[PDB]
Amino acid sequence: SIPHLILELLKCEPDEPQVQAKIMAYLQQEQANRSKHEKLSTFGLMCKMADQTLFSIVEWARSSIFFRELKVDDQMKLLQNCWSELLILDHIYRQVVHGKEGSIFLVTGQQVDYSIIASQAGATLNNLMSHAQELVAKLRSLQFDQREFVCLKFLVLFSLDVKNLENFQLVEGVQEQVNAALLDYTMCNYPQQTEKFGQLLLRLPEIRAISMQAEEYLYYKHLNGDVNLLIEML
Amino acid sequence: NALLRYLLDKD
Ligand SMILES: C=C(c1ccccc1)[C@@]12CC[C@@H](O)[C@@H]1CC(CCCCCC)=C2c1ccccc1
């Protein structure tokens, strides 16, 4: 059985083939317009890929239950607090679902060998990708499913760390009801995994940590001249 | 963040 609240969250999920196809196409034209001597570095393509993912994340939030009831200023504060966390959570879940070991699956539908990416990503991003892979492995061993994924999406979006909100009560309420729905859902559907609910919640600080460090690295890369919506959110 | 406001307000 599925709590009705979780069904309402599921109804807000985007059309994933369409989201990925749109991003794939954008990046294809990008490289096509570029002449022989001005192709995008691999880090550069990842920045544009992340940029375009953020557009789809904003569109998802905008139309989502509860979020669409916030005034725009509250909506902006929430997204500014969690945009990198939603990026990384989406990345992690993509590896959980489609991930083979030794490769990374991108929002474009491309599968890339890890040895290729690790050669170019540099020590810091390799470290953060490695931590993310550790979460992938843990979530895979717990049978992390789509109902739990959308719960964590809304728990990341409706964060209690965001202050100066006009309607903090709504954010507090969504946090509490989604938590209660996830606690109930994991019991009913995975009764033998006592640790599942706790193991899911403990990933959120870890994703937060990875995401905040990811932001700090990218802000450094921007200040260093190595990098749109991505810059605005930074 | 004018861009984020626009993405939330646009029709
Ligand atoms: C936050 C990222 C990033 C943004 C700008 C530049 C580089 C990375 C991501 C998150 C998912 C993809 O959008 C991005 C691609 C990716 C993995 C491959 C990076 C290869 C660099 C040459 C990201 C990622 C995933 C986990 C932990 C940190 C970053």
Side-chain angles (χ1 to χ4, degrees):
Chain A
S1 184
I2 304 173
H4 291 186
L5 175 58
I6 290 176
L7 293 172
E8 298 290 341
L9 308 186
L10 285 174
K11 284 187 281 187
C12 292
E13 276 293 276
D15 184 20
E16 194 66 6
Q18 204 78 47
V19 173
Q20 300 204 342
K22 181 185 175 186
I23 295 173
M24 178 205 66
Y26 175 94
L27 295 174
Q28 282 170 336
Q29 179 74 67
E30 179 67 23
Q31 284 280 55
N33 292 349
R34 291 178 173 273
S35 299
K36 178 187 168 181
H37 293 282
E38 58 183 13
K39 298 296 184 177
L40 274 161
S41 65
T42 305
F43 177 77
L45 286 172
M46 299 300 92
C47 287
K48 292 182 176 296
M49 193 183 69
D51 183 65
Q52 295 298 301
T53 306
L54 294 182
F55 278 93
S56 73
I57 288 170
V58 175
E59 185 66 13
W60 161 78
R62 168 173 188 178
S63 294
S64 287
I65 183 169
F66 303 130
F67 191 88
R68 63 197 177 208
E69 291 171 331
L70 292 166
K71 300 197 185 175
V72 176
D73 293 292
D74 274 4
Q75 294 182 334
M76 293 172 65
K77 291 179 185 181
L78 288 187
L79 284 169
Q80 287 169 344
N81 175 74
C82 77
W83 64 270
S84 63
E85 192 160 9
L86 291 172
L87 240 207
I88 296 295
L89 177 62
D90 181 71
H91 167 78
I92 283 170
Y93 185 64
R94 185 168 301 102
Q95 314 316 306
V96 170
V97 178
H98 306 101
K100 310 177 188 298
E101 209 156 343
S103 54
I104 300 291
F105 280 77
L106 307 179
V107 69
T108 58
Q110 301 171 229
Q111 179 184 346
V112 181
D113 240 83
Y114 194 91
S115 62
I116 304 292
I117 294 294
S119 291
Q120 318 173 64
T124 296
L125 275 180
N126 280 338
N127 186 236
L128 298 175
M129 292 180 58
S130 291
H131 295 344
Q133 285 298 143
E134 294 168 6
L135 278 73
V136 170
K138 208 170 285 175
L139 291 167
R140 214 193 292 265
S141 73
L142 297 171
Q143 299 181 95
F144 189 47
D145 71 31
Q146 195 206 26
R147 290 73 175 275
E148 299 158 342
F149 170 67
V150 302
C151 284
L152 269 46
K153 279 184 78 179
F154 276 81
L155 294 178
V156 166
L157 179 56
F158 286 84
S159 171
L160 305 174
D161 296 332
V162 187
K163 54 185 186 192
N164 307 135
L165 290 170
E166 185 199 10
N167 202 350
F168 191 67
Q169 295 275 17
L170 176 64
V171 179
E172 185 181 329
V174 176
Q175 176 69 220
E176 291 177 348
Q177 291 301 323
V178 173
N179 208 88
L182 176 64
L183 180 58
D184 185 36
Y185 173 85
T186 58
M187 175 205 68
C188 289
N189 295 263
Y190 302 90
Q192 307 304 128
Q193 295 186 229
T194 302
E195 75 281 337
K196 183 163 196 189
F197 173 80
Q199 288 292 354
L200 289 175
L201 294 195
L202 288 168
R203 306 292 74 85
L204 291 178
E206 298 175 349
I207 298 168
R208 175 68 142 186
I210 294 170
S211 302
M212 297 296 96
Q213 295 181 103
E215 290 192 43
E216 287 204 294
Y217 176 76
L218 289 177
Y219 202 115
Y220 160 67
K221 296 293 288 179
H222 178 50
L223 298 171
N224 207 37
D226 300 330
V227 186
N228 58 23
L229 177 58
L230 177 62
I231 301 301
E232 301 294 331
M233 301 304 298
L234 282 167
Chain B
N1 197 329
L3 180 55
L4 180 57
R5 185 178 300 274
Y6 162 85
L7 296 174
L8 294 168
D9 284 347
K10 67 183 178 58
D11 301 317

